[PDB]
Amino acid sequence: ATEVTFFDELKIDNKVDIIGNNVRGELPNIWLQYGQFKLKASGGDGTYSWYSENTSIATVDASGKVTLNGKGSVVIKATSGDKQTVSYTIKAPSYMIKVDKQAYYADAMSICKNLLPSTQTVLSDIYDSWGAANKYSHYSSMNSITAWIKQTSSEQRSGVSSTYNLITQYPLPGVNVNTPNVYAVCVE
C-alpha cells in the first residue's frame, strides 16, 4: 500500500518548437514540405502518445515531433498515460513549398505546372519561418538547394532567371535557364 499522485489536466502547448531555427512560437502560416516541429504536452502523468487524424497532411512520432506532408488542415491528438486526450489543430497554410528534382527553367515550369515561386521573398520567407532546409530529416543529406524563381518579362527575353538557395540564402541573378544543379521548387 503506497501513496497516490495527482496531476493537472492534459494540455498541448500552443507554443511550437521549430526544429530548423530553434524558435518557440506558433506554427508558421507558410509551410516547407517536410518541415518539422515539436508539440509540447503538459499535465497528466508525463507520459504521452501522439496520433494524426490524417497522415496525408501531417505525421507525428512518439516524441511529439510532427512532420508536414501535405497542404491542408489536420488534427493531432496527445494521450497521457492517465487516459487523457487533447486535440491540437493544424491550420492549412497560405502556401506550401515542394522540392522536386533538378531541371532547367523551362522543364521546372512544366514540372511545377507553372507554379514556380513568384519572387525571392516567397522562398526567403520560408527560411525565416523554418531555417535551413537541411536541418530537417527529409533534406539532411543535401548541402545546397538552389531553387528557380519565376523569371521576369525581361529575364524571359534574355534566357535567364534568378535563383535562391533554401539552405544558404544565396541569391543569384542572370542564371541561364539551361543551368544544371537547380531544383524545381513548386509553390502550392
Numbering used by the authors: 747 to 934
How does the study describe this entry?
Intimin, an out membrane protein expressed by EHEC and EPEC, is required for intimate attachment to the host cell and formation of the A/E lesions. The binding of intimin to Tir mediates the adhesion between the pathogen and its host cell. The intimin of EHEC O157:H7 is of γ-type (designated intimin-γ), whereas that of EPEC is intimin-α. Here, we determined the crystal structures of Tir-binding domain of EHEC O157:H7 intimin at 2.8 Å, together with an Asn to Tyr mutant at amino acid 916 (IntN916Y) at 2.6 Å.
In this study, we solved the structure of EHEC Int188 and its mutant IntN916Y. Crystals of EHEC Int188 and IntN916Y diffract X-rays at 2.8 Å and 2.6 Å, respectively. R-free values were separately refined to 29.6% and 26.8%. For the native version, Int188 consists of four molecules in the asymmetric unit while the IntN916Y is present in two molecules per asymmetric unit. Recent study have demonstrated that four important residues (S890, T909, N916 and N927) of EHEC intimin are essential for Tir recognition. Int188 and IntN916Y behave completely the same at the level of higher structure (not shown). For the mutant, IntN916Y, the folding mode is completely the same as the native version, which indicates that this amino acid substitution fails to influence the alpha-C backbone in Int188.
